[PDB]
Structure 1
Amino acid sequence: ETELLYKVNEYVDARDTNMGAWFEAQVVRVTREDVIYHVKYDDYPENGVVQMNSRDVRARARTIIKWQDLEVGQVVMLNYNPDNPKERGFWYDAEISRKRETRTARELYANVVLDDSLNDCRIIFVDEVFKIERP
């Protein structure tokens, strides 16, 4: 039932559909864009092999968008913590909503995708925002 966009053994990012965050994973098998990916998590072997929808897997993030180049309306991958926004959390997709700079302060607001989205979030890790790799 093998199908041969991301090839078997290629490293990817996989979206935990339960919480909406992206995690480093690897493609173990590809089955039959309406393709179903078989994936293992790099840091979570207790997860076993998980079947993934083709939209829930993409090329691993590699490019940081610097604070200067961040613009309102971009969809990016960034670090946020829904339960306590002041702390480090997980890599969610987000729409840059508001961007403000002061002499001493850099302020970033984003609509975080959790599907349901979480509007007007104060993003702490403003220097660690990723470009989402498109095919």
Structure 2
Amino acid sequence: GMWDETELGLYKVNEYVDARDTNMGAWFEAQVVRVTRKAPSRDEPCSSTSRPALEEDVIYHVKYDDYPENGVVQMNSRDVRARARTIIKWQDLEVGQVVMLNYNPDNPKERGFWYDAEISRKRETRTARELYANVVLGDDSLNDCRIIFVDEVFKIERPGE
């Protein structure tokens, strides 16, 4: 499970993850504090022990590893991705590979969060070498966006490698 939108993900107690804010669709530091899927077992004992699905197909409850104030917030397997630790170099940036990446939507020349995109185009010049991605927010999505921070694109992580 490497590039080309491998589409993986399986997280656990204190397995470091990135997570999407449902409000701007951004990816940031999130430490896992509970993996479970809300079935009180099967038919409601006051316990909430059992998970109906596999450790991949369940629910994840993060504590934002940079933002401790915003507390325990719950996201699903598709809307969390593990802590994207391995850099995608310039040469591996596949057109149509979904990545999470250095962009700010308020100032697109600047650094903000790791917004989720797919490579839409690649180009290089005498002075500058660039990426162009379809960027996705938690509402809208901005096509052929000027990717300035080339050195810190991240991909979908493993489930458990």
Please state which band the TM-score falls in when normalised by the shorter chain: 0.7 to 0.9
- Structure 2 portions without partners, runs of 5+: 36-54
CA–CA distance in structure 2, aligned partners of residues 86 and 65 of structure 1: 20
Moved over 4 A (4+): 1-4
CA shift digits 1:63-111 (9 cap, x unpaired): 1111122232221121111111111111011111111111222121100
The DSSP-based 3-state class of the residue aligned with 2:25 is coil
- Higher share in strand: 1
Q: Which residue of 1 aligns with 2:119?
A: 96
C-alpha contact (below 8 Å) 2:6/2:156 kept by paired residues? no
Contact 1:108 1:122 in 2 (8 A): yes
Does structure 2 conserve the Cα–Cα contact (< 8 Å) formed by 1:74 and 1:96?
yes
Larger-gyration structure (1/2): 2
What is the match of residue 31 of structure 2?
Answer: 26
Identity of aligned residues (%): 99
Give the number of aligned pairs: 134
Question: Following TM superposition, by how much is the alpha carbon of 1:134 offset from its aligned partner in structure 2, in angstroms?
Answer: 4.2
Q: What are the superposed Cα offsets for residues 37-66 of structure 1, whole Å, 9 maximum, x if unpaired?
A: 121011111101111222212211011111
Q: 1:77 to 1:69 in 2, by over 3 A?
A: same
In the superposition, the TM-score normalised over structure 2's length comes to 0.73
**Paired residues of 2:7 and 2:156 also in contact (CA < 8 A):** no
Q: 1:46 to 1:3 in 2, by over 3 A?
A: farther
